[PDB]
Amino acid sequence: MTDLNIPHTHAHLVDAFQALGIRAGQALMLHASVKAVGAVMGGPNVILQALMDALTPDGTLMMYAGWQDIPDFIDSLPDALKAVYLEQHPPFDPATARAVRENSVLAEFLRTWPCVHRSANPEASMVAVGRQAALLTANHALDYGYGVESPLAKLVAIEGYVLMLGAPLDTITLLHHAEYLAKMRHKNVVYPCPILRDGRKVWVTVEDYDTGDPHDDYSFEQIARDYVAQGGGTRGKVGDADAYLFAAQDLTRFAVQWLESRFGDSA
Amino acid sequence: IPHTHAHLVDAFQALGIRAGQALMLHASVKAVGAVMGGPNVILQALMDALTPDGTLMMYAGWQDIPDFIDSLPDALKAVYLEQHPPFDPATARAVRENSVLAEFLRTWPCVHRSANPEASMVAVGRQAALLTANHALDYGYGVESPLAKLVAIEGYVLMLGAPLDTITLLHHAEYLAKMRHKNVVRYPCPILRDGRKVWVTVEDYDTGDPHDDYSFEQIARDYVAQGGGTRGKVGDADAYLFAAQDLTRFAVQWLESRFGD
């Protein structure tokens, strides 16, 4: 066994974020495992407070939220059960829809922050605070939620960064944007979703690339590990966690080239 | 100055290796750095710390297992069925990834190797026969397996620069866990029976992909984060030492609370 630490302070997390390369005004997408950072004096919100302190109010912080309770599976239910879901399941409400189960404690904290913004796409919904929170989350199209009209696309375009805080590299949502952009020999295209329109629940059909299964013989772990191996990003400790800092545009470029050279029209 | 035998012994003991322990090793020889006398000195140092009363195991598998023959042209499959050699524990090579040390261990005097081709384990030391004996061909990571026995004798898993995703013991956790759905595989394999090649059908849980929305890295990272195991440097490698019983219990709970029915 390994015993818990004396709790990390706000100031010592700011120092570590800066030592890693976080700079004022950057736009960051964070993937974190809170337990991996270790005990923090004041709890997990201090992680976010420290990171925004390193970024200043001129910086921007975004996290993937999705929607834990999306009823995207109801076509597989028998007719009577499906009818029950159609009538009784709540719509996606950006104010109260809970983020996906894993590695999302900080996303849920971010939702109680004043001036938080949440994008409109339920399954692909992102949350953000800071200078470009509105810009990044605006007009997130319902179809192809990781594509050209996504917060991921905008993060790449404003040359933001991805910060890994003890989360496995294959949870980098940006890699779904690489899948979207890459010209590949086989893609799976897929579902119902209740949303709010003028304050009333309406069911819509969302069209997207499948993001549950890969489009071919690969895994996100493979791409990311290949990226780190070739020098991508910077590394450093943040609390007890091993942290990685990646340029969004570079990683996206690398991943699209990775996918196209194996399964693309250049293979 | 390459790492000396003594330097590695002291690092193993600093990490928590002790005389008499039964240990499964997962290593990346590259990660350790140059060792004076080569990679075998890693194993000699570890066995020195364990003493002859200790036991050292690694996953070997079978690099050349022809479990893919049904996906070949029929004409080629027919050639495989006539000409591909059976699994022979004496000479079957281990799988290529992170296995330099497993191949070294296969030349140790008194090494034992378990009979399940795909799931084959090699071991030396006091309990090497116990661990490798009567390894069932079906469900090779299940109840009749070296992993089950490693847990029963309160052994350990030592990660020596190898990735946390490569912990074979977690396939035993997958076997044990009551989950909503587990994928079963059935595949052909030639083995030796009374000195003769016989092709058989092996049944197992899939070990190539997880049975649900998880990764082994994620489980082991959660384990470490909640205080599981010890950590430290061995040579140039990041090392982790886990108790096999506690890690299995943690991983089964982890799987059941997330993907149970």
Ligand SMILES: CN[C@H]1C[C@@H](N)[C@H](O)[C@@H](O[C@@H]2O[C@@H](CO)[C@H](O[C@H]3O[C@@H](CN)[C@@H](O)[C@H](O)[C@@H]3N)[C@H]2O)[C@@H]1O[C@H]1O[C@H](CN)[C@@H](O)[C@H](O)[C@@H]1N
């Ligand atoms: C309309 N959506 C479904 C389309 C359907 N055709 C897909 O099969 C289905 O995906 C299954 O569920 C994944 C769990 O992640 C399994 O894939 C995992 O298993 C292996 C695969 N190699 C791992 O290696 C890999 O990492 C994967 N994690 C798939 O079997 C989709 O729903 C999921 O994905 C949605 C994201 N849009 C979530 O919103 C849902 O809650 C739901 N989890």
Ligand SMILES: [Cl-]
């Ligand atoms: Cl978390």
Ligand SMILES: [Cl-]
């Ligand atoms: Cl190796």
